[PDB]
Amino acid sequence: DRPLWLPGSEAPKWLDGSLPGDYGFDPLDLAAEPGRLNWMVQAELVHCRWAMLGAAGIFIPELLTKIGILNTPSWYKAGDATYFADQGTLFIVELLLMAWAESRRWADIARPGSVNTDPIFPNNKLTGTDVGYPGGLWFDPLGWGSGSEDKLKEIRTKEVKNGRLAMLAVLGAFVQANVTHVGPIDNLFAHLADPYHTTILQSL
Amino acid sequence: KRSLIFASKQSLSYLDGTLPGDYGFDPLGLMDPEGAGGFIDPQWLPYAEIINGRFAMLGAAGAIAPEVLGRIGLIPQETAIPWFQSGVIPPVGNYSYWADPYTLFVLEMALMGFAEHRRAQDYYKPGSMGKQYFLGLEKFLGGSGNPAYPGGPIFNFLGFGKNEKELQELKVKEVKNGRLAMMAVLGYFTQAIFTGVGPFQNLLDHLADPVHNNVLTNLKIH
């Protein structure tokens, strides 16, 4: 039917053919129970989108810092720099603003098509019909995610794949700076210099 | 039809399975209805078991909670002390609270009397605590037919056990956890005497070197 993670195999029954990025990769059957599949697809959507943003703040800064256009600190040292606010205050402000946005999304997931109206002004509405893809003039200012179902799967598939790669990259940076005690981009430009003696094994 | 631990022909005559934790374990025949009396009778022993077990659940999860929470480091370390050093036994250890432990004991006796006497009067005369005026909330403390399970708006405010099957399974789970907590408190006491350190310290000592940290190596007291 479709190219799966393994060339010779049979896709799990629950992952029939529908969701974007569907490749029948579920060895552990972590979405076999009915109803859990909807939760997981939303969960992966959230992580990947966060990871995309998190990778652009871990590599692009260091990308245009090592060559030098910004002079920003490293990703793993930005947690101590003094900013106009306080680190603790910034944490709490995030927590409440995150609470509002996360809570609005949670209500959408639990009851689809119930949080589609602006509270302050009950005239502005959010254009969205698929859970996890809410449009409107804020999230979708260009109308690039509405129309034929065919293009929806393409762009959605493009979205998740870049996201899956992004999640993997950020996991690297985390562990991969933890043991090497050096920046990610520095590792890249040290791996293309002497590739055969700059490997995971030679870092213990 | 059920698991039998150390049942007998005599015990199985009156232990049939109605009670939640009923497994026929009555080697001493203490719940024989033929010679029912004051406190040794079928109506009181399950109730006493449930109450001892509930207080033991509070004890086993309370005699070790401050020590664990101080080990993980979120309560002050001076409050992270073994249970026997919290003023319950002043000789082994004492702590200075807002009131001296005898004033605290008198306050505890007053409050626990107001609660325990009402529980007793509901056991002996069911429904008698929902008639006389009691600060206007005597209607919450009415109870049900079973003394051990009032299940009122206060004692059951999340409303578990809507159906009878889940209710009975939850009863069995309560009885099992209570028996475990009772045995755990007995272990707390004996280990406090034989070791001199808190239960979590004993657990960590056993987890460190199991073969040189056990009852056999540690009945040297110190």
Add this chain to the structure above:
Amino acid sequence: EWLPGNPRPSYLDGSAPGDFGFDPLGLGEVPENLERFKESELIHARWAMLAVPGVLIPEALGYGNWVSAQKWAATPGGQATYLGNPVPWGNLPVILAIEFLAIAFAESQRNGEPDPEKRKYPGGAFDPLGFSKGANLEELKLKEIKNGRLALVAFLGFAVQAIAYPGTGPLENLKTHLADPWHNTIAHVIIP
């Protein structure tokens, strides 16, 4: 309505003041217990609304706070000013056993009234300005319950951020927040 879209519980409809469907647990399932809890809510809310101005006005004039006196406090009457320059009759006693002797009276003459709606909204003798004898009574009850809930939350604050900074002004805390909006917040007690 506390959560948009969340279905209303079958026993919490938009009839009585409030009724925003906020009952995650379900403590008010029984109609009579719900009726009693409503009255408990109004009593708590009215007490909180009375209390908060008594903690906001005094300090604003620079006379201390609600931490100024609850035990072993100003013996010469009320501090030395405003409430009458040591005018008050109960001058020396600070733990003053005349306040927990008349609130008992107000209780005792309060408890023992039929007609729950009149148990909660007496009217008549307790309506000097006759605002209840109007057509906007339901709106007024809603406004009262709303600032009542707000006062309850505000006094919960008062308590917690009196126990978090022993000795301070619960409104000079607003001064501290305004002097350093983004630098000093609750984070001090949440994250050091």
Add this chain to the structure above:
Amino acid sequence: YIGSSTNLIMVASTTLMLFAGRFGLAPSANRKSTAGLKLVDRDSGLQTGDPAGFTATDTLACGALGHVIGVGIVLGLKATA
């Protein structure tokens, strides 16, 4: 201490007593001794998972008597040698 003579004596005594009680070589709850020291069968009323009929009370009795005999032997061998 595991290889000590005291440990060996105590283990042997307890094991021998348990073996005698379990395999009908000593009186038990279901094995009564008459005046002629002959073992007859009785219904003690205690149900046990042991196919032969060894009960928890039988185990406790045999272990207690084995410990008694082992302590006697250990102290006697210490006092004599």
